[PDB]
Ligand binder design. Structure first.
Ligand SMILES: CCCCCCCCCCCCCCCCCC(=O)OC[C@H](COP(=O)([O-])OCC(O)COP(=O)([O-])OC[C@@H](COC(=O)CCCCCCCCCCCCCCCCC)OC(=O)CCCCCCCCCCCCCCCCC)OC(=O)CCCCCCCCCCCCCCCCC
Ligand SMILES: CCCCCCCCCCCCCCCCCC(=O)OC[C@H](COP(=O)([O-])OCC(O)COP(=O)([O-])OC[C@@H](COC(=O)CCCCCCCCCCCCCCCCC)OC(=O)CCCCCCCCCCCCCCCCC)OC(=O)CCCCCCCCCCCCCCCCC
Ligand SMILES: CCCCCCCCCCCCCCCCCC(=O)OC[C@H](COP(=O)([O-])OCC(O)COP(=O)([O-])OC[C@@H](COC(=O)CCCCCCCCCCCCCCCCC)OC(=O)CCCCCCCCCCCCCCCCC)OC(=O)CCCCCCCCCCCCCCCCC
Ligand SMILES: CCCCCCCCCCCCCCCCCC(=O)OC[C@H](COP(=O)([O-])OCC(O)COP(=O)([O-])OC[C@@H](COC(=O)CCCCCCCCCCCCCCCCC)OC(=O)CCCCCCCCCCCCCCCCC)OC(=O)CCCCCCCCCCCCCCCCC
Ligand SMILES: CCCCCCCC/C=C/CCCCCCCC(=O)OC[C@H](COP(=O)(O)OCCN)OC(=O)CCCCCCC/C=C/CCCCCCCC
Ligand SMILES: CCCCCCCC/C=C/CCCCCCCC(=O)OC[C@H](COP(=O)(O)OCCN)OC(=O)CCCCCCC/C=C/CCCCCCCC
Ligand SMILES: CCCCCCCC/C=C\CCCCCCCC(=O)OC[C@H](COP(=O)(O)OCCN)OC(=O)CCCCCCC/C=C\CCCCCCCC
Ligand SMILES: CCCCCCCC/C=C\CCCCCCCC(=O)OC[C@H](COP(=O)(O)OCCN)OC(=O)CCCCCCC/C=C\CCCCCCCC
Ligand SMILES: [Zn+2]
Lengths: 226, 186, 93, 98, 141, 122, 124, 51, 100, 152, 70
């Protein structure tokens, strides 16, 4: 959005030193129990394990492929929530302009709390009036006293929580078959051999499953000076 | 008071039990000295580039802004749980620790003064070096000047070395040290 | 280790033949005693001792020299005056 | 058309595996760009050279499956299989299906 | 340009109101739905209708304005842009050259002439009997 | 094509140059890269005014939810005890300042002979 | 004033027109982030300030006041015998400033002074 | 407030009395005339210097 | 890339303003009939006549102006007691001989 | 004198003693004269930007000696500035309502002298020294000190 | 690739073989009927990067080899 500042380096990828060292437990943790860093590396390890196995991709369904990469198959419930989330974020630093509100289609006023201050400017052209500010509280269909424009408050609330991308992913995504560490090892040997590492994440991940320091050059990789 | 003050350390175990964090150094993770690491890695000592050794001690700062990002947990040394929670911190650090913390809180101001003072010393040297010297003869008699206007007003441009010598002899006469100095011949 | 953007042109990991023992922090793990920093070697915090010590010495030298100059040299208009501001030797006032 | 054409974030590569731009003070190593172009070849010249993505041939059957299931996606997948997909072609594919 | 302007010289965030011209309209187009044909009455409003990311063009603008921040190479600007970027720098440098090779020589000549004739070569010699160089800018007399 | 060490051989002439020339070229190259630039590297790294502003500030955690001290704590006290100590030290100087300021008022009051208001007419 | 963004706004050519104003209105604006929104805000401002009849009265008053102001400044510099920008006369004693004394009488007899002085009989 | 007023008060009162007695050089001059009277010498070496 | 000012605004309004100032000043001079011939000298007629006499050799060279007035102030009386124009001329003559 | 090169090449070689010309005509040589940290960003520069930068840098560094010459002549001129006539005290000249003490509010050194009136201060310092009070300055002849710019 | 280009003198025979194999594979996959996703038949040992040949550890060539005094 225009109100956001510049992408960080982390916005693209995370450093491999932030990979959890207990990979064996990481790949067995349920999604609802994974933190932001743990969830990043669960998806990256599992997603790259399937993508770096070309011979199996054509026989893998889009439902299974999306699960491996950690992408959520969309549906009307989740689409509604995500859309209203992105609309809330956009309105943080953007103007609020849209069609005239009526009983059939009230002006939708997203909010996290139970109230949001709103102003009615009336219709277009000569039907526009001076700003009339009012407090839009949930559970009431508001009508402007001047132009009769109907307003309504929409709350991004779900089960004692507000709506977030993390909440939407946890509520609607279902964990599939438990990730098999044999796949990690098999793909690791595929792209990492004879001092050539073409899957750096899988070389670090396999090292942790082995106990940290087992694979060649990994003790030297983990030895820091400050 | 606390163990941390008694035995200052940077990034050890049992930080919470030790009771305080005495080092403002943040970051690390470099594989070599002076190498690319995480965090900003700033301190009063043992950081940056060593002039005497001509070697890098820590790498360039990794800012927590767009140009960089967060620090991996493996290399975090200032735990906010212990860094904050200042309840009764004065008892943990003692009076000398309080003095140390105050002095260490002004590293930014110290960094500035180290960069600002040198030029000002140079400017002051200009003043001191000039103040020692006798004043030049700014003015002479109004009448005598106009009776020899051309020589005085234009002597410098025509021959500056002889004009300089003439000025010196007049200074020696105006301050009564003519018989105590030998003015070099031109 | 640095940015995720800088990388080697050829991705190679050395098969180190040296038999040096592994530094303790190289094989370390997060622990309840060490929630953070377990991958970095512990070091001495010289600043905590050197900053307050050096500051005291400089202040003592600064004040002691100032007192000395203003009490062990003849009275004068400035410090430079009290050092190089007397009349020429042999000039009786 | 932003920041004078300088990307805010970009990849740099180094030939020496143990090279550190912050610790070392040598004067012989020449950094490369994301495509591998050495830094001594100016941007105006390297940007004219055509760079295409080469995937291992074991991926061709997968890229073929994608094209058939989504015919609108087929022309982009065909370019990738034939080694004719530049970065610009990839960007067009990415934003077309958003 | 030196000064930052949100609309034109937005280098702090790099935001651009419209997509690159290189992109086909089928891939990305400027966010402009002013020409939308009238909606049939039997169509029903599903979305909010509010101007925002529900519109495809606006969504793609936001997406691109964030994913454009990483690029494999530089987008070389043309020489016209490069000249404008350092217009003041180049002009000041030429001003320094003028001050050394144009102002310098004639100023020296004037002083040397003044030495011999009492007044600069671009002044009217006086007869009043007053002494000194006198004015230098003759056109401000 | 033979590649010489950077900055050691001229490309302007097929003749490398005479002994004095080569000495000047080699030694200036060394002085710039390994002697003069020691000062610049020292100032840039060890005395950065912007690194010093972040001295004593906690690391920025990669986990986004572990940096809440950014808004839970005011920026003036991001430094923990160091920043609290600086405030506390200046706090200790309040009453010394009051005595000092009160003395100035007394100094002016006395110098203006305002204490002799009654003695003047007695 | 059109109410649909599809209907274009007429602009003259020159340095103060609808097109000239559009180019510069949003230079410092954080709110004009896309064409649709930018045009809506631009027309909103134009409608409010340039289609307001009474606003044009103030435009007349600023022009009149500024024109008088610029001219009175210029007149002092160009004609007032006591304002010196050149230095020739200031490098001479008062009795020798003939070129500056030439401004005196012409400046002492402006047209309006001759035209309005006869009307003192309406005050005395 | 009074506690820290005392040391400032004492310092200023001594300073004020000194300043009323004369300038710094008038003070050193009075000690020079006294030294010239003690020795009966019209001109004596300046302080910190020998004869 | 969008422009706010005239493409050559700095030179345009600098040289342009100077041109308008110069032209307006000429117009103002014409309307008031101001003499436009620069005189760098003082206009004291008696003084300029004394200066011509010096140039003609009627008054000896380097003779001060206070050696020619009919009223002298105190400081000029002080100077007249030490004034020797004849000696000054001889000294200048000696300098010329040495130089050549 | 070497005959293995042309006269033009010899002149250019000597002007390249510091490598300036070589860095202009070789991109590789310019990038390898940068310290490694900044060499990382070099590949993005255009040749237009690179040579324009060198041109601005070279013009500046080549004019510094000229400014240095102009400044030295200025110092010499001030070091031997000609004496000027003593000012007659005109109708509105040398008006004083109070002594000059803003520099020394408490000490009140040289109350009669003006802030940078060096000759008045010298005689005033002499009085203080004659009164057994040391003052700094105005004692060494100019020609016997370094950096005076008054020596023949 | 640019890194390989620095060693084209030695890699040329492999590069020519690699070119042929990639072309064979492209042809086979393109010509296959829709729904046929079998792997192409080619010699992967000459194609880099692939599991069969993960490449070579190329030495840096940024080393001066000339004496400035000659
Ligand atoms: C019988 C018994 C006998 C016993 C005998 C015993 C004898 C013992 C002898 C011992 C001798 C020791 C000798 C040590 C030598 C060290 C030399 C050294 O460090 O060199 C400096 C340094 C070495 O660099 P380095 O190796 O990276 O650093 C080594 C460490 O300094 C090394 O230090 P460290 O690691 O230990 O500590 C680090 C830190 C530790 O620092 C501290 O501990 C300091 C603590 C201070 C606390 C500050 C508190 C601030 C807040 C106060 C409160 C304010 C508010 C109060 C208000 C009220 C509050 C309520 O120290 C510093 O960083 C010190 C500063 C060093 C750089 C200085 C740069 C120049 C500054 C110039 C401006 C200032 C001039 C002032 C002049 C004054 C008159 C003399 O070299 C340079 O500075 C290089 C200069 C190059 C100049 C080039 C010019 C180029 C021109 C080009 C023109 C074209
Ligand atoms: C083996 C090797 C061995 C080597 C050995 C040698 C090593 C080197 C030795 C070097 C020694 C140097 C000695 C001289 C130092 C320069 C002194 C100086 O310049 O001052 C005099 C100098 C010239 O004056 P003067 O004629 O010599 O002074 C006459 C005396 O003050 C006559 O006194 P007064 O009666 O006029 O005093 C009145 C009093 C005013 O009296 C009062 O107001 C207080 C009266 C009550 C006293 C009892 C306390 C009661 C409670 C007070 C509460 C106060 C706080 C309240 C709140 C705030 C109110 C303001 O004012 C003061 O005392 C002034 C200073 C105040 C404290 C300043 C901070 C310390 O003053 C200046 O030019 C000002 C200072 C300029 C230079 C310093 C700039 C500092 C910049 C920051 C960085 C500095 C880095 C330094 C690094 C050094 C490394 C070594
Ligand atoms: C007598 C003493 C005079 C002393 C003058 C001192 C000037 C210092 C700055 C010089 C400088 O670096 O200028 C070059 C530099 C050139 O800018 P650039 O973006 O590289 O220009 C690109 C092209 O020239 C093409 O640029 P562009 O035409 O596309 O437009 C971009 C540029 C165009 O502007 C400039 O470049 C400005 C150049 C100024 C040159 C002055 C000589 O825009 C700005 O930089 C705007 C800056 C903000 C202006 C704010 C004005 C506030 C006051 C408004 C009036 C309020 C009272 C009204 C009362 C009456 C009501 C009826 O100017 C600046 O960036 C400085 C802007 C701020 C100056 C503020 C001065 C005080 C007001
Ligand atoms: C072992 C040695 C340790 C030394 C440690 C540092 C000592 C600093 C204190 C010191 O030396 O004080 C005397 C020192 C030299 O003064 P002084 O002329 O010997 O004594 C004053 C006379 O009683 C009265 O002379 P004045 O009436 O000519 O006043 C001179 C001026 C003394 O200060 C200055 O003259 C300022 C020096 C920087 C001048 C920068 C000028 C920049 C251009 C401005 C415009 C043109 C100015 C032309 C003059 O007085 C106050 O600023 O200056 C100060 O009083 C403070 C200097 C440091 C700040
Ligand atoms: C067939 C066609 C041939 C045409 C030939 C054209 C020849 C033209 C020659 C022009 C020569 C100009 C020389 C100017 C010398 C000025 C020297 C000078 O003043 O130096 C001092 C002065 C500073 O003095 P200060 O003491 O500081 O006093 C002033 C400030 N207070 O320094 C400067 O001005 C520095 C700049 C010096 C510039 C010298 C310019 C030389 C120009 C040569 C041009 C040759 C053109 C040849 C064309 C050939 C075509 C076939
Ligand atoms: C960039 C290349 C180099 C340029 C170098 C220029 C160097 C000199 C610059 C000096 C300052 C600018 C003015 C120059 C004026 C030149 C002509 C001149 O001498 O003018 C003299 C003349 C009067 O001279 P005197 O005969 O002594 O007086 C007689 C009785 N009144 O003065 C002027 O005209 C110049 C002073 C006024 C300048 C500005 C014009 C006056 C009106 C100002 C209006 C201000 C309000 C806002 C206006 C907005 C735009 C309409
Ligand atoms: C002519 C020469 C004269 C020299 C005079 C020197 C006098 C020195 C007197 C020193 C007295 C001791 C001061 C330090 C301990 C004071 C302990 C005390 O009870 O002080 C209370 C008192 C006020 O109470 P609160 O500020 O509310 O206290 C809680 C913390 N804020 O605290 C202070 O004044 C602390 C002052 C510390 C700095 C003193 C600096 C003096 C500089 C000279
Ligand atoms: C901050 C500004 C600091 C300025 C310090 C220098 C002040 C200075 O030089 O002032 C003197 C300067 C020249 O005056 P005279 O000495 O009489 O000139 C005679 C020339 N022989 O001007 C003044 O005296 C005005 C000083 C005003 C206060 C300056 C400090 C604030
Ligand atoms: Zn309404």
């Amino acid at each position: 959005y225009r109100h956001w500042h510049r992408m960080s380096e982390d916005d693209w990828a995370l450093p491999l030193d932030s990979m959890p060292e207990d990979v064996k437990t990481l790949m067995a943790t349920p999604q609802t129990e994974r933190g932001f860093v743990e969830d990043y590396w669960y998806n990256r390890i599992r997603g790259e394990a399937t993508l770096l196995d070309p011979e199996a991709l054509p026989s893998k369904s889009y439902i299974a492929l999306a699960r491996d990469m950690g992408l959520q198959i969309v549906d009307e419930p989740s689409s509604h929530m995500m859309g209203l989330i992105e609309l809330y974020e956009y309105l943080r630093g953007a103007s609020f302009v849209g069609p005239f509100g009526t009983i059939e289609n009230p002006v939708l006023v997203p909010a996290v709390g139970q109230e949001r201050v709103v102003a009615c400017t009336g219709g277009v052209g000569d039907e526009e009036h001076f700003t009339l500010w009012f407090r839009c509280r949930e559970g009431f269909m508001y009508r402007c006293g001047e132009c009769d424009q109907i307003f309504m408050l929409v709350r991004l609330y779900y089960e004692d929580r507000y709506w977030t991308q993390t909440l939407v992913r946890d509520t609607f995504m279902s964990d599939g078959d438990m990730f098999d560490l044999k796949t990690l090892e098999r793909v690791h040997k595929m792209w990492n051999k004879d001092e050539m590492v073409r899957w750096e994440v899988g070389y670090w991940a396999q090292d942790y499953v082995l106990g940290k320091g087992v694979l060649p050059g990994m003790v030297e990789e983990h030895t820091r000076v400050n | 008071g606390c163990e941390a003050v008694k035995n200052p350390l940077i990034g050890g175990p049992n930080q919470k039990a030790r009771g305080a964090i005495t080092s403002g150094f943040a970051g690390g993770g470099a594989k070599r000295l002076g190498g690319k690491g995480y965090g900003i890695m700033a301190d009063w000592c043992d950081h940056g580039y060593s002039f005497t050794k001509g070697q890098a001690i820590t790498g360039m700062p990794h800012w927590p802004l767009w140009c960089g990002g967060g620090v991996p947990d493996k290399f975090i040394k200032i735990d906010p749980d212990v860094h904050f929670n200042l309840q009764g911190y004065r008892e943990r650090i003692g009076w000398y620790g309080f003095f140390t913390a105050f002095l260490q809180a002004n590293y930014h101001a110290f960094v500035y003064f180290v960069r600002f003072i040198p030029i000002n010393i140079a400017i002051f040297w200009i003043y001191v070096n000039e103040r020692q010297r006798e004043p030049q003869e700014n003015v002479m008699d109004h009448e005598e000047f106009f009776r020899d206007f051309d020589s005085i007003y234009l002597g410098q441009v025509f021959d500056h070395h002889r004009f300089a010598e003439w000025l010196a002899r007049r200074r020696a006469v105006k301050w009564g040290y003519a018989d105590q100095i030998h003015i070099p011949p031109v | 280790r640095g940015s995720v953007f800088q990388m080697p042109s050829t991705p190679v990991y050395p098969l180190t033949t040296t038999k040096k023992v592994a530094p303790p922090t190289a094989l370390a793990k997060r622990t309840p005693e060490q929630p953070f920093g377990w991958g970095s070697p512990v070091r001495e915090d010289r600043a905590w001792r050197v900053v307050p010590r050096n500051f005291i010495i400089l202040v003592i030298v600064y004040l002691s020299g100032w007192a000395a100059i203003k009490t062990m040299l003849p009275r004068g208009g400035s410090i430079l005056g009290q050092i190089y501001g007397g009349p020429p030797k042999g000039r009786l006032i | 058309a932003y920041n004078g054409g300088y990307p805010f974030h970009y990849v740099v590569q180094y030939d020496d595996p143990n090279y550190d731009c912050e610790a070392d003070f040598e004067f012989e190593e020449i950094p490369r760009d994301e495509f591998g172009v050495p830094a001594h070849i100016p941007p105006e010249l390297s940007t004219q050279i055509r760079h295409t993505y080469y995937v291992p041939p074991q991926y061709y059957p997968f890229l073929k499956k994608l094209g058939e299931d989504t015919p609108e996606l087929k022309p982009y997948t065909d370019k990738l299989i034939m080694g004719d997909m530049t970065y610009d072609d990839y960007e067009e594919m990415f934003y077309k299906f958003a | 340009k030196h000064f930052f302007t949100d609309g034109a010289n937005d280098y702090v965030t790099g935001w651009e109101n419209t997509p690159p011209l290189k992109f086909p309209a089928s891939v990305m187009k400027p966010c402009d739905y002013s020409m939308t044909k009238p909606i049939p009455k039997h169509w029903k409003l599903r979305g909010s209708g509010i101007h925002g990311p529900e519109n495809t063009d606006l969504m793609k603008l936001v997406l691109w304005n964030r994913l454009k921040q990483k690029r494999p190479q530089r987008e070389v600007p043309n020489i016209n842009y490069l000249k404008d970027s350092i217009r003041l720098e180049l002009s000041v440098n030429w001003w320094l050259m003028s001050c050394i090779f144009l102002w310098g020589p004639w100023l020296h000549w004037g002083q040397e002439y003044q030495k011999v004739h009492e007044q600069p070569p671009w002044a009217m010699k006086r007869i009043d009997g007053l002494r000194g160089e006198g004015y230098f800018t003759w056109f401000l007399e | 094509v033979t590649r010489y060490p950077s900055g050691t051989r001229t490309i302007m002439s097929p003749y490398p140059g005479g002994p004095v020339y080569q000495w000047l070229r080699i030694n200036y190259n060394y002085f710039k890269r390994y002697q003069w630039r020691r000062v610049g590297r020292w100032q840039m790294r060890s005395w950065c005014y912007w690194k010093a502003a972040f001295y004593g500030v906690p690391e920025w955690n990669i986990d986004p939810t572990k940096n809440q001290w950014r808004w839970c704590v005011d920026p003036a006290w991001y430094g923990g005890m160091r920043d609290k100590a600086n405030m506390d030290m200046y706090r200790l100087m309040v009453y010394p300042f009051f005595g000092y300021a009160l003395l100035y008022l007394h100094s002016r009051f006395k110098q203006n002979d305002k204490y002799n208001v009654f003695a003047k007419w007695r | 004033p059109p109410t649909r963004l599809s209907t274009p706004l007429y602009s003259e050519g020159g340095a103060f027109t609808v097109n000239w104003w559009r180019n510069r209105y949003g230079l410092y604006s954080r709110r004009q982030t896309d064409p649709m929104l930018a045009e809506f805000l631009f027309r909103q401002q134009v409608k409010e300030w340039f289609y307001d009849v009474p606003s044009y009265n103030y435009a007349a008053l600023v022009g009149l006041a500024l024109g008088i102001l610029v001219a009175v400044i210029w007149r002092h510099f160009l004609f007032n015998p006591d304002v010196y920008v050149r230095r020739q006369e200031l490098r001479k004693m008062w009795p020798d400033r003939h070129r500056q004394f030439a401004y005196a009488v012409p400046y002492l007899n402006p047209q309006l002074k001759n035209l309005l002085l006869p009307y003192k009989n309406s005050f005395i | 407030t009074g506690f820290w007023f005392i040391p400032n008060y004492i310092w200023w009162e001594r300073r004020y009395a000194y300043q009323k007695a004369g300038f710094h050089w008038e003070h050193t001059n009075r000690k020079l005339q006294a030294r010239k009277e003690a020795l009966g010498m019209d001109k004596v070496p300046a302080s910190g210097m020998d004869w | 890339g969008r422009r706010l000012l005239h493409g050559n605004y700095f030179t345009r309004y600098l040289f342009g303003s100077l041109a308008v100032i110069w032209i307006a000043e000429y117009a103002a001079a014409c309307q008031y009939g101001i003499p436009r011939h620069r005189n760098p000298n003082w206009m004291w007629s008696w003084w300029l006549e004394k200066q011509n006499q010096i140039k003609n050799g009627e008054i000896p060279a380097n003779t001060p102006g206070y050696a020619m007035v009919k009223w002298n102030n105190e400081a000029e009386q002080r100077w007249l007691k030490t004034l020797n124009v004849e000696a000054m001329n001889e000294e200048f003559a000696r300098r010329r001989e040495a130089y050549y | 004198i070497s005959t293995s090169e042309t006269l033009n090449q010899k002149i250019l070689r000597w002007l390249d003693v510091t490598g300036m010309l070589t860095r202009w005509h070789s991109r590789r040589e310019f990038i390898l004269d940068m310290d490694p940290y900044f060499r990382k960003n070099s590949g993005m520069w255009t040749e237009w930007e690179r040579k324009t930068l060198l041109f601005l840098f070279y013009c500046c560094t080549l004019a510094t000696p000229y400014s240095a010459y102009l400044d030295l002549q200025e110092l010499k001129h001030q070091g031997t500035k000609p004496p000027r006539p003593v000012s007659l005290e005109s109708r509105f000249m040398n008006q004083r309502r109070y002594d000059f003490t803003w520099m020394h509010p408490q000490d009140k050194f040289c109350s009669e002298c003006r802030p940078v009136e060096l000759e008045c201060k010298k005689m005033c310092f002499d009085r203080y020294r004659s009164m057994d009070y040391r003052m700094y300055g105005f004692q060494r002849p100019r020609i016997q000190t370094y950096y005076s710019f008054s020596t023949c | 690739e640019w890194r390989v280009l620095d060693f084209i003198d030695d890699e040329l025979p492999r590069l020519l073989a690699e070119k042929r194999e990639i072309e064979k594979a492209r042809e086979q996959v393109m010509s296959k009927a829709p729904g046929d996703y079998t792997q192409p038949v080619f010699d992967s040992s000459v194609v880099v990067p692939t599991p069969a040949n993960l490449g070579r550890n190329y030495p840096t060539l940024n080393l001066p080899s000339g004496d400035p005094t000659e």
